[PDB]
Amino acid sequence: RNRNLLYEYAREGYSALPQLDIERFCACPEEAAHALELRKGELRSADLPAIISTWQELRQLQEQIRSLEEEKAAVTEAVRLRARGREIRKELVHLYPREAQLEEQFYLQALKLPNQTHPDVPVGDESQARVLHMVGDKPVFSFQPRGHLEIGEKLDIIRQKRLSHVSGHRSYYLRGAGALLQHGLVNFTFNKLLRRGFTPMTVPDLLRGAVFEGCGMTPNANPSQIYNIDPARFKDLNLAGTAEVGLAGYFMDHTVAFRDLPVRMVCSSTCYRAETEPRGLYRVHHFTKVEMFGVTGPGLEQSSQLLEEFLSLQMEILTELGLHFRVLDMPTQELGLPAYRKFDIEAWMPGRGRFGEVTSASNCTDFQSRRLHIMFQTEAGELQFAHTVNATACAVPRLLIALLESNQQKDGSVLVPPALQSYLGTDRITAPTHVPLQYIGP
Amino acid sequence: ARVLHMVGDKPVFSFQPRGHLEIGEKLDIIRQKRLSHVSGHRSYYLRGAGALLQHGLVNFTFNKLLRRGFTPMTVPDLLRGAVFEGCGMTPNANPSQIYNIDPARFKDLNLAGTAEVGLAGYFMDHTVAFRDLPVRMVCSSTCYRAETNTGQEPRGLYRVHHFTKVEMFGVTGPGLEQSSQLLEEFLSLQMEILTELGLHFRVLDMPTGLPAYRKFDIEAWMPGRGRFGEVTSASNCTDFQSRRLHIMFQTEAGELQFAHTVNATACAVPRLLIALLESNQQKDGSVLVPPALQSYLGTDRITAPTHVPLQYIGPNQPR
RNA sequence: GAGAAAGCUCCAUGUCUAACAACAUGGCUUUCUCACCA
Ligand SMILES: Nc1ncnc2c1ncn2[C@@H]1O[C@H](COS(=O)(=O)NC(=O)[C@@H](N)CO)[C@@H](O)[C@H]1O
Ligand SMILES: Nc1ncnc2c1ncn2[C@@H]1O[C@H](COS(=O)(=O)NC(=O)[C@@H](N)CO)[C@@H](O)[C@H]1O
């Protein structure tokens, strides 16, 4: 019916069993209950005692198993007593199934537990979320600016009409200047990060369920938003929600030299979200976004500093583009299961009339590393778990909407910012020379 | 299988040719070790110089095509079954190259085998003005192939489930001559691109697939493989993608007619990477970067990465 | 991609053993087969 793929992975032996954090907060039950309630994840404080009790029972059984194994090893070495060995073997075999079942039940419930919440994260809804700062101002417009979809259809750059038969609902197409603008945006962000020293990386779109669970997303659920391929054609294959999931999978079960840390990887790849607005590019099933994900040093201070640098990069990119953007700290309620600290950057959209969230940065310091066993070995040779920070530099659909609506004009021409001016080759855009398509459908 | 043209000279190497995977692994650009669970089987990761090469090649080809007037375009990744049927690919058969989304979760949703299916969907049931013709648009998107052969060279980068492939799609006038000349132009453009890169290559003509009326196959000589490898496939089509999808173009008279479709591949990151790495292979394992791509990479000669390669701490290791 | 074989290029879960090993199930690494490259 319902079963995790991480416990199955550890049981089969594919990867080392993850190290849970229950022992970390077992010291004070009230603190953990308060943090979990504030996060308001799927698990609730009401159900925490059952998980803790099962864990304690599991620990006692494991200690007993270790003692019996030690006695059996001692008798075996001395003989190398037979009746005692037979009795010990019978006792251990009888106890083993029960211990395995107990472990399965406890780990199944424990996986649901979310990560620690940073004290400086406000508690409340998205509206309750605090605003860090705003760069730029709304452009003055003599007349009401039109919607991005309408401007796109008028210029024929974006085609969203009559697409159900071909691409299904919420499907969009980019043509002409729109396509060049998207390519220019991806290349401009890539070049800026490469100059900053980010190491380019490419991640496969298809990924297995274990990696997704480690990332923290729910791979299979009734309302699940991740696309899963048919089991008959292929088994345990899912479409990457974001590039960071692929990068995490690449880093799963591997070590990095201490000198290399911090490691920054920039990956550009298509992301498919089920997302189960009626029209427009605000909600799209698939889109292309450049993603910067980096694994920092063990120190939490280092992880936070890396997240701050990523935020600075996002701000510099949007300032260069010239869009009006406000950076607001995400609330505890929406932080999510795998995110410690999350920053949301919303770009003003005149046509939409509301700020739109386009960039999200998440500190996965202890959840993703523990789930996938990503660790960094120090010079002495010890292995220390490494914090991972993942953020999105830019998304073509949201940035296209913001740039088009911000630079729209009365004649219908859309101005192009100077940074993308070199890539496009035209200071502005004009009505398409080519005749727009004619619908001949019955 | 006639050889229309042969260009370039085979490189001369004192030492024996080295496989692309070995050169990449020593250089660390591409890792394909114990990636079964993480990314499925026969997937690949490009890092360091390899990623720069992939982005550089796609951007260089895109700039060259745009200079010639190609209208840039992007297509939706998810496509419906009817679109695939029109393009000549059928997912009904058990062995298929088209990934199939779960029917219960979503109905009739299939990943784009190639970018051509997306572009064909764009022109479905629509009429193009007789003056716009011919119309050539270049779309760059990742393409996923459902089945990659494991019988030969399984542990190789040559065949992969997901590869980045620039695709050029061009609609032409009613005349067969128009489509043929358009395809000829496409072939000349791709040949020029290969010559700029410097890869030795031979272009042959495929006899008679069923959807394509005519075909052109470009194979690039790779030293590490030691044998010719197909790198591009441009295949003309005549009133078939349109006649299946009901794609028609309105002439000056206004009569409805079915336009011809020509599809060509500007470049594919995996085969080009193999040929580029192998052709410039050096004694120390370093790979020379052609001057054309020097600006994009920005490094004259690739050297061993300073960062230490990743070690495996997973349970499936001898102890 | 499908099937099959082997243990190495070995790691796990179990049957009789005081216990190594020996045989099973599965993973991984190789090898042998039948098949698509739109
Ligand atoms: N249904 C959607 N359709 C199109 N674009 C979307 C959609 N949802 C979010 N986006 C865009 O994609 C970005 C992804 O941000 S996020 O999913 O919430 N966070 C991540 O993906 C983490 N991997 C960041 O490292 C958003 O900021 C927004 O710009
Ligand atoms: N398994 C594969 N892995 C990576 N690239 C591939 C693969 N198969 C084909 N290609 C790329 O796609 C090119 C054309 O082969 S093809 O997909 O069967 N034919 C087409 O793509 C044309 N119909 C338009 O793309 C190849 O030369 C190569 O560049």
Would you say B43 and B243 are in contact if contact means Cβ atoms under 8 Å apart? no
Residue A81 shares a structural domain with residue A127: no
Contact (CB<8Å) B72/A210 = no
Give the C-alpha separation, A351 to A145, whole Å. 6
A214 belongs to a structural domain: yes
Q: Which of A154, A141, A147 is nearest to A413 (CA)?
A: A154
Cβ atoms A176, A155 nearer than 8 A: yes
Report whether B231 belongs to an annotated binding site. Answer: yes
Side-chain half-sphere CA neighbours of B172 within 13 A = 24
- State whether B126 and A437 contact (CB < 8 Å): yes
Pairing mode, if any, of strands A199-202 and A263-272? parallel
Residue A381 touches chain B, beta carbons under 8 Å: no
B121 CB contacts (<8 Å, ≥6 apart)? A166, A167, B75, B76, B79, B80, B83, B245
Number of domain units in chain A: 2
> Is the C-beta atom of A208 closer than 7 angstroms to strand C?
no
Does one domain contain both A324 and A233? Answer: yes
Single-letter residue type at A126: E
Alpha-carbon distance B166 to B62, whole Å? 8
Instruction: Please count the other Cβ atoms lying within 10 Å of the Cβ belonging to residue A356.
Output: 18
Q: Are residues A212 and A357 in the same domain?
A: yes
Report which bound ligand comes closest to the CA of A388: 1
3-state secondary structure chain B: CCEEEEECCCCCCCCCCCCHHHHHHHHCCEECCCCHHHHCCCCCEEECHHHHHHHHHHHHHHHHHHHCCCEEEECCCEEEHHHHHHCCCCCCCCCCCCCEECCCCCCCEEECCCHHHHHHHHCCCEECECCCCCEEEEEEEEEECCCCCCCCCCCCCCCCCEEEEEEEEEEECCCHHHHHHHHHHHHHHHHHHHHHHCCCEEEECCCCCCCCCEEEEEEEECCCCCCEEEEEEEEEECCCHHHHHCCCEECCCCCEECCEEEEEEEEEHHHHHHHHHHHCECCCCCEECCHHHHHHHCCCECCCCCCCCCEECCCCCCC
Residue B213, both tokens: 């009326």
* A13 CB closer than 7 A to any strand C atom: yes
Whether A202 and A337 map to the same domain: the answer is: yes
Residues A199 and A58 in one domain: no
The answer to whether residues A208 and A107 belong to one domain is no
Chain breaks after residues in chain B, where C lies over 2.5 Å from next N:
208
Q: How far apart are CA B84 and CA A185, in angstroms?
A: 30
Backbone dihedral angles phi then psi of residue A206, each to the nearest 5 degrees: -70, 135
Q: Judge contact between A369 and A19, C-beta under 8 A.
A: no
Q: Which of B202, B230, B243, B286 is catalytic?
A: B230
CA A415 to chain centre: 33
In this complex, the residue with its CA at the shortest distance from the C1' of nucleotide C12 is: A13
Domain shared by A191 and A264, yes or no: yes
For residues A158 and A175, is the Cβ–Cβ distance under 8 A?
Answer: yes
Residue A2 domain flag: no
Whether residue A124 is found in the same domain as residue A109: no
* Structural domain contains residue A329: yes
Domain boundaries, position A47? 20-114
A14 in a structural domain:
no
Would you say A366 and A115 are in contact if contact means Cβ atoms under 8 Å apart?
A: yes
Q: B3 has which bridge partners?
A: B204
Return left, alpha or beta for A336; rule: phi > 0 is left, psi -120 to 50 is alpha, else beta.
left
Residue pointed to by tokens 């395995």: A100
Nearest to B46 by CA among B200, B218, B276: B276
Structural contact between residues A285 and A170, judged by C-beta atoms closer than 8 angstroms: yes
| φ, ψ (nearest 5 deg) of residue B251 | -85, 180
In a shared domain, residues A80 and A211: no
Q: Which of B219, B271, B278, B279 is catalytic?
A: B271
Residue A99 and residue A131 share a domain = no
Does A8 fall in a domain?
Answer: no
Q: Is B184 annotated as a binding residue?
A: no
Closest residue (CA) to C1' of nucleotide C25 is A12
Q: Tell me how far apart the alpha carbons of residues A199 and A190 are, in angstroms, rounded to a whole number.
A: 10
Asked, as a colleague might, if the bond just before A262 is cis with ω within 30 of 0, I would say: yes
Q: Which of A108, A130, A109, A116 is nearest to A34 (CA)?
A: A116
Under a CB-based contact definition with an 8 Å cutoff, are residues A204 and A408 in contact? no
Is residue A104 domain-shared with residue A131, that is, in the same domain? Answer: no
Distance CA A79, CA A75 (A): 6
- Interatomic CA distance for residues A61 and A207, integer angstroms: 36
Q: Measure A344 CA to C29 C1' (Å).
A: 45
Which among A56, A90, A114 is the end of a domain? A114
Q: Which residue has the tokens 């729209």?
A: A408
DSSP A414: B
Question: Cβ of A422 under 8 Å from any chain B Cβ?
Answer: no
Breaks (C–N over 2.5 Å) after residues, chain A: 80, 276
How far: B149 CA to C33 C1' (Å)? 14
Query: What gap in Å lies between CA B43 and CA A214, rounded to an integer?
Result: 20
Contact B73 A171 (CB under 8 A): no
Pocket of ligand 2 from Cβ distances under 6 Å: B 114, 116, 145, 148, 159-160, 163, 165, 167, 230-233, 235, 263, 265, 268, 270-271
Helix (H) or strand (E) holding A352, with range, is none
Q: Provide CB contacts within 8 A for B67, sequence distance 6+.
A: none
Is there a domain that residue A155 lies in? yes
**Strand C close residues, chain A 276-295, CB < 7 angstroms:** none
Q: Is residue B117 a contact partner of residue B83, using CB atoms and an 8 Å limit?
A: yes
Nearest Cα residue to A285 out of A207, A170, A400: A170
Whole-angstrom distance, CA of residue B6 vs CA of residue A377: 52
* DSSP notation for A69-83: HHHHHHHHHHH--HH
Find tokens 């299946």 and name the residue: B244
**d(C-alpha A15, C-alpha B270), whole Å:** 30
Question: What's the CA gap between A244 and A372, in Å, rounded?
Answer: 13
Q: Exposure of A16 by Cβ count < 10 A (0-12 exposed, 13-18 middle, 19+ buried)?
A: middle
DSSP code per residue over A116-141: PPPTTS--S-TTT--EEEEES-PPP-
Does residue A435 lie in a domain region?
no
Euclidean distance between CA atoms A200 and B299, whole angstroms: 14
User: Helix crossing, A48-79 with A82-111: angle to 10°?
Assistant: 160
Sign of the alpha-carbon torsion through A14, A15, A17, A18: negative
Say which ligand is closest to the CA of A399. 1
Q: Taking chain B, what is the end-to-end CA distance rounded to the nearest angstrom? A: 53
Q: Which residue ranges of A are tagged as binding site for ATP?
A: 273-275, 284, 357-360
Is A4 part of any domain? no
Selection from A202, A222, A127 nearest residue B48 by Cα: A202
Residues A97 and A212 both lie in one domain:
no
Q: Report CA-CA distances (Å) from A99 to A68, A104, A154.
A: 14, 9, 67
Q: Which of residues 83-112 of A touch strand C (CB under 7 A)?
A: 85-86, 88-89, 93, 96, 100
| Nearest residue of A to residue B103, measured between CA atoms | A230
Residue that terminates a domain, selected from A66, A94, A114: A114
> Could B55 and A190 be called an inter-chain contact, meaning their C-beta atoms sit closer than 8 Å?
yes
Contact A296, A386 (CB under 8 A): yes
Q: Domain boundary at A75, A99, A114, which?
A: A114
